[PDB]
RNA sequence: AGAGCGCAAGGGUAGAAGGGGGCCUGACUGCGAGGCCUGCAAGCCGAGCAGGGGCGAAAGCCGGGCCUAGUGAACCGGUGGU
RNA sequence: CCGGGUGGGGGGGAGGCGCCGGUGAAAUACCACCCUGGCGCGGCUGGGGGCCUAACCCUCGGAUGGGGGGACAGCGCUUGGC
RNA sequence: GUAAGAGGAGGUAUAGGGAGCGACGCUUGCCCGGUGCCGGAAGGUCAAGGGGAGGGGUGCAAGCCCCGAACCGAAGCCCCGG
RNA sequence: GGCUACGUAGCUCAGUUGGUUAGAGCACAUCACUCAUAAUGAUGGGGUCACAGGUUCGAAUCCCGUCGUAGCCACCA
């Protein structure tokens, strides 16, 4: 439900993506998880958009 | 009707006001799709000008009145006499 | 009498419908200072960011690639070790945590504060009713929370400026000092334009650069083609 | 093993799936042998390869949750990119 | 805000003020813009009323006109509603 | 009746159209909450229009074309009472 | 969706551009007055100004984020 809602994660260093979910209710401020983009190896990943 | 000048007779059905509701984009469209059909017809009016030896009227188009006064100008140039209202008015043009 | 005699002549030199730009302003407004001493070029800058917008009142922290000449003395509350740094900079009696009452128990003579982030916390909670509200205490962007804020002590001893918005963007850029002629006026004003464009809001539509009024301090000022 | 394993029951499980701590973020990418299932469609399962990544002394596990419900082909378009 | 501020006319005259100190959030001549509310105008831009007739419309024993209404009414296009 | 015009009526609020009841005798109680209807020159919402702060394509440029805020644009429904 | 207004004591309602010192009638409370109830006067309990954030030294008085309430236009592959 939109409370857990649905958001996506983009890398810094210009764009990139990966598919995820959230949980605003739970102590969920923002997120800087650590994944892999299409280009190169594993890196940052920043939280953004709907 | 039909103007005595440059035609200007009615228009019907798929003339239009349609209705529609129409498409664009303001989401998936303004309201997307939208569609219907209607009716539409011209203008006409009255110009009862004197000129020459008598008085005469006109069924003038929306914006073809200066043309009427022009016909007046051409009218003055010739011999417009006797008693014959629309009869003269026709010899005009 | 109303605006004085000096300002009636100095009125017959404004023609309140002019521009000058940074150039003619530099020169003729270098003249527009016949009053006392070191009139501060008061670039008076006004824009449009709705006198708060929650967090859009600039801060702009600038030195104007020259110098002022006045004094701030900083004081600093720099937890012993940081005192050392400030001790080769310009910070009077740096007092680790003790010159706090020489601010709080009524003993002024200072500006800025630089202090630290350490004591910031501590020393924030004490004088945040005077230096804070009025304009000295930390404001973590007014050159007052750090040890790289001592490099900033030299920054504040070469020019701080704290561009804020109050009710009109307003800010009064300070240099001019009626002893700088063409050169330093040109370069100073242009520099301020630079820092100006540097600190920008995130979507506040309008004229980012109306009022400039480049008044020395005692006279005329009419705009600078708010750009060049 | 009658406890627990979110939620209904069923299967199962203390040689762990349960309960405590440390590092983390494999709800990974490009693919997929060969099988479940089945009118179509869709759904289920997965070794390995390869990039690189977490943890592990290693051996090694990792394509979320012990598993079965928490789901909607297409047409329309919204939004970021190529 | 009943406290004084703001302005002009004058008498008359060589004399009258601003910082710190003091107080509080702030210090009060002067200078810069701006806000509050107002007031006058200049650009744009509308709301409301009167008078006029000559568009348009009514009528009176033929009327080239007199009398009534009149920029609405009638209509043409378009605008949203019911 | 698309219309010209027609009936109304060469009649004029004791006159003309629409509705409920149905001689005459008695009589016609409470509710304006939902709605219909009457009015009400403050106002919310909303149209094309009017306007132009602001953005873009493109030409070297002059320019051309599109997007468009503030704010003024009705009926109406909401609102107000009967 | 977009725009608008309101939500503060158990009830019902003001204080609204600050800067003070958060109220009113009902009701509860122990009284007072009357020989007697009621009428009314007094003192207390109840606000946690729709919840937070930020503006200010100092907001229930302002901008902002979430919801609840309603109003019209208006969206729904």
The CB density around residue C129, as the number of other CB atoms within 10 Å, is 11
**B28 CB inside 7 Å of strand G:** yes
CA B43 to chain centre: 4
Residue B57 to residue B54: CA distance in whole angstroms: 11
Biggest CA-to-CA distance, chain A: 34
**Bridge partners of residue A8, in order along the sequence:** A19, A48
Say how many C-beta atoms besides its own lie within 10 A of residue B41's C-beta: 12
Alpha-carbon distance values, A12 to A44, B51, C38, C152 (Å): 7, 85, 49, 31
| Cα(B67)–Cα(B61) distance, integer angstroms | 10
Cα–Cα distance measured from residue C15 to residue C223, given in angstroms and rounded to the nearest whole number: 12
Q: In sequence order, which ranges of C1-148 are alpha helices (DSSP H)? A: 6-9, 21-31, 81-88, 101-104, 118-127, 131-134
Chains in touch with C (3+ beta-carbon pairs under 8 Å) read none
Q: Can you name the residues that pair with A10 across neighbouring β-strands?
A: A46
Residues 6+ apart with CB under 8 A from B62: B8, B42, B43, B44, B45
Environment class of B15 (CB within 10 Å of its CB; exposed 0-12, middle 13-18, buried 19+):
middle
Nearest C-alpha neighbor of C210 from the set C98, C71, C64, C46 = C46
Q: Please, are residues C25 and C208 in contact by the beta-carbon 8 Å criterion?
A: no
Structure-token pair, residue C120: 């910031």
Give the burial class of C157: count Cβ atoms within 10 A of its Cβ; 0-12 exposed, 13-18 middle, 19 or more buried. buried
Residue C128: which nucleotide is closest by CA–C1'? G57
Q: Which residues touch strand F (CB under 7 A)?
A: C 205-207
Q: Residue C95 corresponds to which tokens in the numbers above?
A: 């007092």
What b/e sequence results for B50-86 when a residue is b if at least 16 CB atoms lie within 10 Å of its CB, and e otherwise? ebbeeebebebbeebeebbeebbeebeeeebeeeeee
**Residue (of B75, B81, B79) closest to B93 by Cα position:** B75
- Cα–Cα distances in Å, from C70 out to C3, C74, C87, C138, C160? 28, 12, 19, 20, 11
Q: Which residue has the tokens 């007046």?
A: B72
Residues 6+ apart with CB under 8 A from C205: C48
Q: How far is the CA of B47 from the C1' of G28 (A)?
A: 88
State both tokens at C56. Answer: 């859009």
Q: How far is residue C35 from each of residues C1, C7, C29, C173, measured CA to CA in Å?
A: 17, 9, 13, 19
Q: Which of C189, C206, C201 is nearest to C21 (CA)?
A: C189
CA distances from B10 to B39, B47, B63, C59 (A): 9, 20, 16, 69
From residue C219, give the alpha-carbon distance in Å to each of C3, C29, C161. Answer: 10, 9, 22
- Nearest residue to C169 via CA among C43, C13, C16, C68: C43
CA atoms within 13 A on the CB side of B61: 15
The pairing of strands A8-10 and A46-48 is antiparallel
Rounded, the Å distance between the CA of B38 and C1' of E77 is 14
Chain centroid, CA C120 distance in Å: 22
């Amino acid at each position: 439900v939109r409370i857990k809602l649905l958001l996506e994660c983009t890398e810094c260093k210009r764009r990139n993506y990966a598919t995820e979910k959230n949980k605003r209710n739970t102590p969920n401020k923002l997120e800087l998880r650590k994944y892999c983009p299409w280009c190169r190896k594993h890196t940052v990943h920043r939280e953004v958009k709907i | 009707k039909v103007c005595e000048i440059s035609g200007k007779r009615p228009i019907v059905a798929n003339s239009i006001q349609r209705r529609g509701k129409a498409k664009r984009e303001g989401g998936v469209g303004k309201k997307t799709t939208g569609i219907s059909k209607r009716r539409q017809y011209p203008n006409l009016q009255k110009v009862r000008v004197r000129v020459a030896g008598q008085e005469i009227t006109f069924r003038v188009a929306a914006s073809h009145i200066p043309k009427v006064y022009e016909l007046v100008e051409r009218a003055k140039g010739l011999k417009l006499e006797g008693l014959s209202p629309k009869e003269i008015k026709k010899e005009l043009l | 009498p109303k605006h004085g005699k000096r300002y009636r002549a100095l009125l017959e030199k404004v023609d309140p419908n002019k521009v000058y730009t940074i150039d003619e302003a530099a020169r003729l407004v270098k003249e527009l200072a016949t009053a006392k001493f070191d009139e501060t070029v008061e670039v008076h800058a006004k824009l449009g960011i709705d006198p708060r917008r929650s967090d859009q009142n600039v801060r702009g922290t600038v030195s104007l690639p020259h110098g002022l000449g006045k004094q701030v003395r900083v004081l600093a509350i720099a937890k012993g070790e940081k005192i050392k740094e400030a001790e080769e900079a310009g910070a009077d009696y740096v007092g680790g945590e003790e010159i706090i009452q020489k601010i709080l128990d009524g003993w002024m003579d200072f500006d800025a504060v630089v202090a630290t982030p350490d004591v910031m916390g501590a020393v924030g909670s004490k004088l945040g009713r005077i230096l804070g509200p009025r304009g000295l205490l930390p404001n973590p962007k007014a050159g007052t929370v750090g040890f790289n804020i001592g490099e900033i002590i030299r920054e504040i001893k070469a020019g701080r400026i704290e561009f804020r918005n109050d009710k009109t963007g307003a800010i009064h850029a300070p240099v001019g000092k009626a002893s700088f002629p063409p050169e330093k006026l040109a370069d100073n004003i242009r520099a301020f334009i630079r820092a100006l464009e540097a600190h920008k809001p995130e979507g506040a539509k309008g004229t980012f650069l109306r009022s400039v009024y480049v008044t020395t301090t005692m006279g005329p000022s009419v705009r600078i083609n708010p750009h060049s």
